[PDB]
From a paper:
Notable among these are the resistance to inhibitors of cholinesterase 8 (Ric8) proteins, which regulate G-protein biology in species ranging from slime molds to vertebrates and, in contrast to GPCRs, act on monomeric Gα subunits. The interaction of Ric8 with GDP-bound Gα stimulates release of GDP, leading to the formation of a stable intermediate complex of Ric8 and nucleotide-free Gα. To gain mechanistic insights into the function of Ric8 and its interaction with Gα, we solve the crystal structures of both apo [name] and [name] in complex with the C-terminal fragment of transducin-α (Gαt) attached to a [name] ([name]) tag.
To assess the conformation of the C-terminal region of Gα in the absence of intramolecular interactions we solved the crystal structure of [name]-Gαt327–350 alone. Although the Gαt327–348 sequence could be traced in electron density, it largely lacked secondary structure and the conformation differed markedly from that in the complex containing [name]. Thus, binding of Gαt327–350 by [name] induces the formation of an α-helix by Gαt335–346 and/or stabilizes such a structure.
Numbering used by the authors: 2 to 393
Amino acid sequence: KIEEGKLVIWINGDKGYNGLAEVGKKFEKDTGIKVTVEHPDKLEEKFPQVAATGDGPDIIFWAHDRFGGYAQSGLLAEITPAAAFQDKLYPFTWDAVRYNGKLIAYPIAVEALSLIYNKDLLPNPPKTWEEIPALDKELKAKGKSALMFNLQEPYFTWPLIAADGGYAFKYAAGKYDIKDVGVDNAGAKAGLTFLVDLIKNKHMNADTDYSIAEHAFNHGETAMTINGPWAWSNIDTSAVNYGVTVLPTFKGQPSKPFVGVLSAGINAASPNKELAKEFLENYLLTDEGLEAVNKDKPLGAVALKSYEEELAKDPRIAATMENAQKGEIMPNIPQMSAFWYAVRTAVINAASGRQTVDEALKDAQTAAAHNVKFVFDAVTDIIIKENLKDCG
Ligand SMILES: OC[C@H]1O[C@H](O[C@H]2[C@H](O)[C@@H](O)[C@@H](O)O[C@@H]2CO)[C@H](O)[C@@H](O)[C@@H]1O
């Protein structure tokens, strides 16, 4: 049930929800409207689940790739900022939140993965992925390891899969061909094979997740990790002297991270749309609002021109944008959910050894193109009981 007269905001648990809450407190000081920020697990799947029945948060934060699927499902209010407000954000960010001719979210910040390295353990980080096995062996001889990053989310392995030619959906001349999936071509195979070989050769562990990799890097056990700007705050707190730099190349080609625009959508079922717009435009998307969030966990390259002009001087933001330029902006099309599901399965199954790389990526190509298609529907949530009073 969406309560009228307050704002409930959902944002992922790796981002600056405490900073966002401080913007919420200022909003409440000025308007009397309470703002509650939450960071539920599996947020990108929980939101459409509950929003399809007319429930959930007033405002949902996620990278823009999920938002077309939400908008297709009728879950997002159309936003209509004044032209003067839109001009305060970089024009391309509005295109990341445009779906079937409608703006369906407010852009917040540009996210790209970078290579993060411990300068004391590895002052000259590898320019190539191919160098990493030898670096790990040298570090293993001294009780350390070269690289740990989250192997549970395909977001983190995609830059390497895409480096030598892997792609999600083919596009040209303003349109994707969503039946032309590029996760099983030679470049995709070569990239995932390199990753799986790192695991088979004991340079990484298939079970490593976000927390395990973060703990190992921030405690100086591994020389490198792969992560986004939000992760820098926890490293700042640690004793690690780190750099943020370009991802290693593979087969002479840049790693190509999928670039996300962290975006704020308004639940189409929210009875607080006017307050949500006021909060997002006049409190969050200001220098002071973004500062509060960014101070908690860095946002990346923010969409708000006035504040990005400050942040762009940070060499970590420069590295973020160098990696971003070498990658691709994620599609926001609904089939992105099938793509991510397919690649997640393939990476997990190839890394664990349940399938070979070639078997896993053959399945992933057919899954993303033909054999997976998610449709949200309020019926999926109904439970029938003998008495109609106990149904729901
Ligand atoms: O791993 C697949 C996952 O990738 C992206 O999710 C990112 C998100 O964009 C970042 O903001 C951060 O939270 O890390 C996530 C990966 O754990 C896509 O946005 C998402 O749709 C996709 O499932």
